[PDB]
């Protein structure tokens, strides 16, 4: 893959996103199901359904609050396996068609109980303030009920892993030790946090090249 | 034009047919459109069976006369049990949707008699679909005995006690998936011999 700066109309086809990991809150069954507890007499009283987390993706338009992109949803495996997918998905709007004003959004719909399946909400930005679309690169995010977002620290380290994809000056022995850095990214699994009312997800969308965007 | 866009294949139009089915109330015309959507559901059951799931889930919003077609819809649920796991969840959504408003007691009694037996799967959605059996039983004593025949819960009393029953019904489907792998392996094996003992 090659990095290069390529503007909106200059860039050709529609976007796609691969999505992989999350952060277990540990407050419930690992699928974020039913809010497990010894008080479960109340769980029978509250009729708490066991929800298997699934996901959905659609983009909030321009921050103009219109609707453009397509909602899309995938299949179901254990979310108690923390549903690590790296699964690609897409919709029908090109980069040439894509307005530099645009924003991603996602809703995690679990599968809970009678007429019941959960719903969680999040949103983010498509391209950079530097116009590069998510720097055409890997990322990680965090979201609460409303007004929450993503940062980069360990995700900044992961962004440096995306700088390995972003083609900083590189060599062949460096590549073998980048297999050793597959061992290092394997070691990166050590991460720990226990927040609430909010959650984290690891989502990589590294492309070949840095987009740029403009009008038609 | 609607039937044309629906027949077009560009699966995005099929998802666009959802809002069409939502606003279809203005059109009081025949079931021919639903038949075209049914053939579309078959052709989807051929290739785009994942999308067939999402379409069928939305297809439960029909809410139309001639309940005799709902039996073919149940057969379409049995056909939805084919492969896609999303089709199972969709069929569960249709199961709850049908659980809200019923049609025929006896046919749905035998239906649910098989379905609840097939609802013992440990899948997260399968449990949700299994929970609809109690809601079905709400709509008495003869049915209580008939259900007690296949009942897996000795201590069952009510809805909460049915929740405790499902809590005692906890099982692992991993070995069941491996058993399915053994079933496919048997399908790859030789079943030619019908001999016994």
């Amino acid at each position: 893959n090659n990095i290069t700066f390529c503007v909106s109309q200059d860039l050709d086809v529609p976007l796609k996103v691969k999505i992989k990991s999350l952060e277990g809150h540990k407050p419930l069954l690992k699928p974020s199901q039913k809010i497990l507890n010894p008080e479960l007499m109340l769980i029978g009283s509250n009729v708490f359904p066991s929800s298997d987390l699934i996901v959905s993706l659609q983009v909030f338009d321009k921050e103009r609050n219109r609707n453009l992109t397509l909602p899309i949803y995938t299949p179901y495996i254990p979310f108690r396996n923390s549903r690590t997918w790296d699964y690609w998905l897409t919709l029908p709007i090109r980069i040439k068609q894509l307005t530099f004003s645009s924003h991603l959004r996602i809703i995690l719909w679990e599968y809970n109980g009678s007429k019941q399946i959960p719903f969680f909400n999040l949103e983010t930005s498509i391209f950079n303030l530097k116009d590069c679309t998510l720097k055409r690169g890997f990322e990680s995010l965090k979201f609460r009920y409303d007004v929450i977002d993503h940062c980069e620290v360990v995700t900044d380290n992961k962004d440096q892993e995306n700088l390995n994809k972003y083609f900083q000056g590189e060599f062949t022995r460096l590549p073998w030790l980048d297999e050793i850095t597959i061992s290092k990214l394997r070691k990166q699994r050590e991460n720990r946090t226990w927040p609430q009312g909010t959650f984290v997800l690891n989502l990589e969308f590294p492309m070949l090249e840095l987009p740029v965007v403009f009008i038609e | 034009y609607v039937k044309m866009a629906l027949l077009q294949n560009r699966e995005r139009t099929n998802d666009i047919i959802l809002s069409h089915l939502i606003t279809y109330l203005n059109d009081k015309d025949p079931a021919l459109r639903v038949s075209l959507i049914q053939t579309i559901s078959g052709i989807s059951i051929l290739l785009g069976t994942v999308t067939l799931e999402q379409y069928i889930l939305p297809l439960l919003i029909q809410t139309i006369t001639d309940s005799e077609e709902l039996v073919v819809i149940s057969v379409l649920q049995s056909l939805k049990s084919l492969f896609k796991t999303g089709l199972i969840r969709k069929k569960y959504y249709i199961d709850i949707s049908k659980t809200t408003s019923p049609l025929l007691l006896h046919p749905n009694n035998w239906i649910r008699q098989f379905t609840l037996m097939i609802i013992i799967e440990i899948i997260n959605k399968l449990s949700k679909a299994e929970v609809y059996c109690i809601l079905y039983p709400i709509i008495v004593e003869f049915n209580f005995k008939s259900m007690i025949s296949c009942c897996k819960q000795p201590v069952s009393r009510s809805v909460y006690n049915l929740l405790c029953s499902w809590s005692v019904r906890a099982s692992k489907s991993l070995f069941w998936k491996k058993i399915i792998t053994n079933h496919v392996d048997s399908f790859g094996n030789n079943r030619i011999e019908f001999i016994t003992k």
Partner: peptide, 18 residues
């Protein structure tokens, strides 16, 4: 003995194709 195992699913590419 037995031949190569049969997977129940296959991974998308999305990498070199990009």
């Amino acid at each position: 003995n037995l031949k190569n195992v049969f997977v129940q699913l296959e991974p998308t590419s999305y990498h070199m194709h990009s």
